[PDB]
Structure 1
Amino acid sequence: KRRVVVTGLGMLSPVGNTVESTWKALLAGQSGISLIDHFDTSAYATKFAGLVKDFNCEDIISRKEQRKMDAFIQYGIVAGVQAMQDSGLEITEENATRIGAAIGSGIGGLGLIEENHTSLMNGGPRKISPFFVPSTIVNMVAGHLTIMYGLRGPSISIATACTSGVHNIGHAARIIAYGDADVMVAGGAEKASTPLGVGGFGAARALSTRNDNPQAASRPWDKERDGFVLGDGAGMLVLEEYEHAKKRGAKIYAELVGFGMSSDAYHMTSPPENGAGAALAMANALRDAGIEASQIGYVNAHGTSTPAGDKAEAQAVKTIFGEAASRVLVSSTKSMTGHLLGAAGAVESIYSILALRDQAVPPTINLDNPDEGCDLDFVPHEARQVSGMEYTLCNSFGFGGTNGSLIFKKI
């Protein structure tokens, strides 16, 4: 009965380039949303996003290698390095084989796809970079990391849109428990704030168009919500077997105890008004942890700031909690951070973990006027302090009706 705990953290987010900075900014309710300026947004209905400010990998990635990797891959490597360093783990010859990676992305290298495609249109197959494939594909973060640290254990990449971070982390954990590994760096990286990403989600009408007030655009569960806001970044956790951790005396942020998956089987984009999909996923994670819905202090919602989306999620929370409806804390850091797509579940598992350490829960900012008959406590504007929270639940409900939920336990 192998148990899995967390002993390493790494992150780049719209509100910070480290774990603690990011975390401090969120408990302070700071918004990471600003107007986009790396491409001309005149024709774009959405002109703002959650960008990573002053990203630097100079000391981490040789500019000779940077040319071979899209921005999402660069974000992922960096957050991966932070996670490995913070872990203290030393990779030995007898170690390698048992240490792996489960890192994905929802969309991958949009930037270098557009670049290479632009080059092919203007100058034919020759303008295409010899690094096109490996610089864009979703599995290249796990690819580069394993090589960088000589990792030789199981290596996978889950690509389930919005649910990627949660899926990757949960399977990295299943892998360990199963016996396939002792250590796994799991998470997701994303950088979809490009013309194709902004115009594409805009073509679907899934995005907020509140350009006058970008920081007020992401407003989950609010009456004036008009779509999600895009966020760039990456979240990485070092997962590891309990005894292998103790035997080495490493910090242990928390324990991963439940993981549940479900499918809506409703529509390619819309969730059921019902929230049936989400319920199942939260329910399976509880059953998996072997606890009840009442034992959960905080739920980091999917809460993307979509009319139909936030309503499905609330409905599901009421459905799985019942009485505990208002007794539980539910918040969406997407209010300050935006939607990190493939990295969303990664960064949010980290908030779910940090919340346990600090007994503090981040707010759902911008929640000026709640919805119709919501009975839930969405930690409305300021961070709430908590007393005896032992378990936290993290939710991701993505495109294609694919849902997941992670449950973390204190110490």
Structure 2
Amino acid sequence: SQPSTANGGFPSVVVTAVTATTSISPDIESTWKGLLAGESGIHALEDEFVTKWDLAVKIGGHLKDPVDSHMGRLDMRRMSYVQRMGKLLGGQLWESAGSPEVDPDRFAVVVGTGLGGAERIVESYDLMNAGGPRKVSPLAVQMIMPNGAAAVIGLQLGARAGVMTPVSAQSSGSEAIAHAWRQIVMGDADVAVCGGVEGPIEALPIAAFSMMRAMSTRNDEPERASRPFDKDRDGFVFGEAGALMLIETEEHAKARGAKPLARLLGAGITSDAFHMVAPAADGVRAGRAMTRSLELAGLSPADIDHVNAHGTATPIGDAAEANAIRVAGCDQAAVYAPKSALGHSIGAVGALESVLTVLTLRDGVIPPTLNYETPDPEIDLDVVAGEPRYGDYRYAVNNSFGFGGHNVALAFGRY
């Protein structure tokens, strides 16, 4: 008999605080109310760079409340953007958790990102080409390295039981929460800050993904552009975000008087070995990530009330994920695709969506998937649409997938 959360072979792990910054709001509770009210964070892009380059994509969700409005003079000169976002969210989360005094030697941080401080690579490159090697900042390395945001949070909050950065492109944010769960259940930590951060919409990221022919170009109706699972979808839309949650053993939470929002029960990680940038059509390995999360949780597929889909609104992505949900035996779950409203934040998105999964369990409600108007027969899923779907949801799986063939599924439960 394998250990599971249900059989007590793993310790119970609970989510005790959440924080996120999104295109709708810097306040996760206001993001959540806005989603439930059918709001979209997607807008016409007004940036100069759009007109400068005449970009084919002219839509996206910038953060409602820009990170750098909270940054001091020295932060702007000593950290890359994902580090600044990490420091902002790290401090917000800790305050939301009641600023607890925890044992630093039992406290881990696991934060994913898609790339790291890449703007400082191009900065350094230009500085050196113009003025030679002594023009490169002595801080360049530490601003650039992709583990930089996780390290800044570890330093800020004092985590001494490991600081890790898993990178798996668009599944990085969920993968980080999986590895944090593992670190606790293996006995390496009792409490962990985890999730994901990502850079803002800029011209070069738009250019590179646009050349994969991946992106929606419904520029005339920005809030209608992102249409996961809909027959008429035409690709993904960027929406900025960063998100963190605090997880800890149930015993640890109870000893300090924390009130859990949900339980994090198990995590599955698999890979397709199919193609570098398309998911396997059959959804079999993706489905097996979901199944592995259920095995570690001790659940059956019939237990799962809700799936928070990766749902990017590409034609081949959504079709693969529908197959994966069928493989896992989860296709009678109520499905939400939050990128319909919040867009795609790449290395942060799995973390944001994990936070939304937690709030669905806490509050008994799934927001409507925006723009879901014409069901697609290849996609026979129960996609929540039109108005929120209320229920006493007991268990839910959050899915995230990434270029490279990475599949991550996280199983959460109502507390």
TM-score by length of 2: 0.93
Q: Measure, in 2, the Cα distance between the counterparts of 1:123 and 1:370.
A: 58
**Alignment partner, residue 337 of structure 1:** 342
Contact 2:81 2:199 in 1 (8 A): yes
Contact 1:107 1:192 in 2 (8 A): no
| Equivalent residue in structure 1 for 2:94, among 77, 81, 84 | 84
Asked if 1:46 is matched to 2:57, the reply is: yes
2:192 maps to a residue whose letter is M
The CA deviation string for residues 375-396 of structure 1, in whole angstroms up to 9 with x for no partner, is 211112322111x211111000
SS in 2 for 1:271: coil
Contact 1:110 1:196 in 2 (8 A): no
**Alignment partner, residue 28 of structure 1:** 37
**Alignment partner, residue 395 of structure 2:** 391
Give, in angstroms, the shift of residue 110 of structure 1.
Answer: 3.4
| Equivalent residue in structure 2 for 1:75, among 85, 97, 112 | 85
**Alignment partner, residue 14 of structure 1:** 23
**Alignment partner, residue 184 of structure 1:** 192
Q: Measure, in 1, the Cα distance between the counterparts of 2:199 and 2:411.
A: 27
1:48 maps to a residue whose letter is I
More deviation in 77-86 or 246-255?
77-86
Q: Measure, in 2, the Cα distance between the counterparts of 1:124 and 1:202.
A: 34
More deviation in 200-209 or 81-90?
81-90
**Alignment partner, residue 4 of structure 2:** none
**Alignment partner, residue 276 of structure 2:** 268
SS in 2 for 1:41: helix
Which runs of structure 2 are paired with 1:360-399 in the superposition (5 Å)?
Answer: 360-386=365-391, 388-399=392-403
| Alpha carbons of structure 1 residues 75 and 274: separation in structure 2 relative to 1, 3 Å | same
2:11 maps to a residue whose letter is R
2:92 maps to a residue whose letter is Q
Contact 2:116 2:148 in 1 (8 A): no
Q: Measure, in 1, the Cα distance between the counterparts of 2:339 and 2:35.
A: 10
Give, in angstroms, the shift of residue 89 of structure 1.
Answer: 4.3
Contact 1:363 1:379 in 2 (8 A): yes
**Alignment partner, residue 134 of structure 1:** 142
**Alignment partner, residue 96 of structure 1:** 104
Contact 1:192 1:198 in 2 (8 A): no
Q: Measure, in 1, the Cα distance between the counterparts of 2:130 and 2:291.
A: 52
**Alignment partner, residue 200 of structure 1:** 208
Contact 1:6 1:254 in 2 (8 A): yes
Asked if 1:401 is matched to 2:384, the reply is: no
Give, in angstroms, the shift of residue 126 of structure 1.
Answer: 4.4
Contact 1:208 1:218 in 2 (8 A): yes
Q: Measure, in 2, the Cα distance between the counterparts of 1:311 and 1:160.
A: 21
Contact 1:274 1:312 in 2 (8 A): yes
Q: Measure, in 2, the Cα distance between the counterparts of 1:369 and 1:133.
A: 49
| Ranges in structure 2 where 5+ consecutive residues have no aligned partner | 1-9
Contact 1:87 1:251 in 2 (8 A): no
Asked if 1:348 is matched to 2:364, the reply is: no
Contact 2:90 2:157 in 1 (8 A): no
Which runs of structure 2 are paired with 1:178-327 in the superposition (5 Å)?
Answer: 178-321=186-329, 325=331, 327=332
Give, in angstroms, the shift of residue 109 of structure 1.
Answer: 2.3
**Alignment partner, residue 62 of structure 1:** 72
Q: Measure, in 1, the Cα distance between the counterparts of 2:36 and 2:337.
A: 12
Contact 1:72 1:233 in 2 (8 A): no
Q: Measure, in 2, the Cα distance between the counterparts of 1:149 and 1:121.
A: 37
| Alpha carbons of structure 1 residues 122 and 363: separation in structure 2 relative to 1, 3 Å | farther
Q: Measure, in 1, the Cα distance between the counterparts of 2:264 and 2:234.
A: 34
Give, in angstroms, the shift of residue 97 of structure 1.
Answer: 1.4
Asked if 1:107 is matched to 2:118, the reply is: no
Q: Measure, in 1, the Cα distance between the counterparts of 2:240 and 2:374.
A: 27
Q: Measure, in 2, the Cα distance between the counterparts of 1:222 and 1:118.
A: 44
Q: Measure, in 2, the Cα distance between the counterparts of 1:38 and 1:113.
A: 22
Give, in angstroms, the shift of residue 341 of structure 1.
Answer: 0.9
Q: Measure, in 2, the Cα distance between the counterparts of 1:121 and 1:73.
A: 25
- Tell me the C-alpha RMSD between the 2 structures: 1.7
Give, in angstroms, the shift of residue 127 of structure 1.
Answer: 4.2
The CA deviation string for residues 200-257 of structure 1, in whole angstroms up to 9 with x for no partner, is 1111112111111221111111122111111222110111011111011102111110
| Alpha carbons of structure 1 residues 370 and 20: separation in structure 2 relative to 1, 3 Å | same
Contact 1:39 1:194 in 2 (8 A): no
Contact 1:192 1:230 in 2 (8 A): no
Q: Measure, in 2, the Cα distance between the counterparts of 1:197 and 1:279.
A: 30
| Ranges in structure 1 where 5+ consecutive residues have no aligned partner | none
The CA deviation string for residues 311-333 of structure 1, in whole angstroms up to 9 with x for no partner, is 01111112222xx63x3101100
Q: Measure, in 1, the Cα distance between the counterparts of 2:62 and 2:69.
A: 19
Contact 1:164 1:342 in 2 (8 A): yes
Q: Measure, in 2, the Cα distance between the counterparts of 1:269 and 1:380.
A: 29
Which portions of structure 1, spanning 4 or more consecutive aligned residues, are displaced by more than 6 angstroms? none
2:166 maps to a residue whose letter is I
SS in 1 for 2:109: strand
Contact 2:87 2:156 in 1 (8 A): no
The CA deviation string for residues 104-161 of structure 1, in whole angstroms up to 9 with x for no partner, is 2012223333333343444444443333222233211221122222222211111111
SS in 2 for 1:10: strand
